Design a protein around this nucleic acid. Sequence first.
DNA 1: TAACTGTACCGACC
DNA 2: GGTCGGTACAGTTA
DNA 3: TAACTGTACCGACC
DNA 4: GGTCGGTACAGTTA
Lengths: 172, 171, 171, 172
Amino acid sequence: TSKKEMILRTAIDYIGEYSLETLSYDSLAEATGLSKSGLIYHFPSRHALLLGMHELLADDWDKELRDITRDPEDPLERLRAVVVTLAENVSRPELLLLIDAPSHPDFLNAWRTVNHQWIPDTDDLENDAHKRAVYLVQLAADGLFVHDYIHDDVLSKSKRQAMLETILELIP
Amino acid sequence: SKKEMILRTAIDYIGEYSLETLSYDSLAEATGLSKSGLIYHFPSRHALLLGMHELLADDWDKELRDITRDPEDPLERLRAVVVTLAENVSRPELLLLIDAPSHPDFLNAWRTVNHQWIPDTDDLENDAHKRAVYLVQLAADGLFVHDYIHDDVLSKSKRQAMLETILELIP
Amino acid sequence: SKKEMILRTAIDYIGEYSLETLSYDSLAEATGLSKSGLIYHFPSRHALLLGMHELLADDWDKELRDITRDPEDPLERLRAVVVTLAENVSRPELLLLIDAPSHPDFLNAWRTVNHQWIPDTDDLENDAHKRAVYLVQLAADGLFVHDYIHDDVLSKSKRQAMLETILELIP
Amino acid sequence: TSKKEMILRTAIDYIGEYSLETLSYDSLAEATGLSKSGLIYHFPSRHALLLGMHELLADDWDKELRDITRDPEDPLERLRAVVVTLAENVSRPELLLLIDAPSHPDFLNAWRTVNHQWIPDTDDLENDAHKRAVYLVQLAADGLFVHDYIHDDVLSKSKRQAMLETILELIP
DNA sequence: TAACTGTACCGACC
DNA sequence: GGTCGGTACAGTTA
DNA sequence: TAACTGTACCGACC
DNA sequence: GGTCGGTACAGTTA
């Protein structure tokens, strides 16, 4: 009967719709049906509530990346899954959370797996043309991830598939 | 003008912290003015935010005009877009671009820029060359946002190199 | 109930000062509670003011039940109106009655007393009896407001003599 | 010229229609089309603006009282004017000021004429029938002055005259 | 017995 | 003239 | 030399 | 996230 995960989904859904500044116990109570004491029961500070949201979303993204990877040892094969989940499996909440995370080490740490085991390493890229060609993909996937929140002019699915394919065809 | 100075301080303030802790009070510190003198200049919070959207939107239209010496070709515009995104737009611009949907006034302030300098998505599905330019656009947005969504700041050396590689890609 | 002790302190504050300077902070000083403890109990200012109106309008109704010994007739209600106006109603009720038009909720809290106890102003051009009762109502009202609009508080004895004079005048 | 009496009149009219707590430099600037600076020139503080208003209205009244007293030796004649100018020639502003007056020595003092040279005397009426029947009249007049602001039942012009006549008939 | 809900407060801040 | 993030603890429902 | 207007700024309170 | 009561001038209009 523990509604601890349901609260987080509700909180994530809420920040997509509205935003972080406006997420508070009262407004999460209103949205969960729960009472404020109820929420405090699982998340005794706002800091825990946010941690849980970061953790929850980083774990969605890790599970998503590992599932769609055909072979986990092939670098290019995992870069392809980074490109794909960035174009389809991450939305507004993740972006707001990525941006909020630097604001506390706890939140940074919650994202360490998926920023250190899936995003390609920046090493001597000044003078390595292949490595820099692998980073160009990463940069382009990141632009397709944030595109609809920064351009005010959403891509339709069809345009987004077309651009996803273009970022893929560019994998070495 | 005292107005532009206050707005400049508010922009650095949000780069360092966020919109949500931008308050008349926290802004009175950073600017040295009293909470009340601040309100004299920006009589509501919405005005203060409208100021900041407008200042940044304008600065962006400025720098990308002082950088293209041929406004004609979508390609020279496109060059201007990549460089400004790569090297002279930071965290505050990203913060206000995210926040902009929350009021029509905010959207309206970026309207000039967001459609005038931004390549056209229009028929992208069938035009390979139009997908080659949007790929550049996307890579630029990638470098613009890079350090604020991966816990890893690029060094100036790395950043310059990725700018070039993107600059290469240009049709 | 803690609500009722809070209203009671607010009633005495406005007796000493005014409604205009009655604020959550100034009522927190006077009650011992914190600003937000008070807001827990009355969540908006409207609610606090509605509470004070309700409380006085209802004490006056009660104080005018254990005094009138035959709710039946116009005259025994009038005697009661006169006595309560003369001696168990002071500056807070005057202040609240002046403020009460500022909102329908407040007027409404004074319905029971304002018509059901106070004699009617109806049919008063032509009925001598009805003018002799309203004369008594005006005098009672005059004694009620006396200390607060004339720079001269009456003593208890002066007040009883006058009370008694209005009471004689009863048709 | 000098807008000074004109500002006070506007301020009086303002609070009649609205009230005292809302009367401010800003709101009085709007009502007068003057500037806050303009108002502060005549009235260096709000205190000085309320006194102006207390002073002005007590003189309108004192003027009105002696304007309508035929024989000012006669204690019953002045009692008649009191009643008359109470039932006919004072309105809301006048009530709000009276009620506010005791909150400051200057305000009390500005009402000293009309309260001393005109209001009959509470002097051993405990044992004196005539004196107390003179107070009764004063008492009913005060009641007709406050009626409309205390009872939520504005009297018609006609009923107000009817009641005024009745208090007057109660005279010597 | 864990998962709540309600009630009464309060300091920093908007 | 409030909100917001707590804190404290008693009383109820799966 | 008086009666304003506008512009910037602030502490206490709401 | 503000209003209310100023303070402090410099310039303007009769």
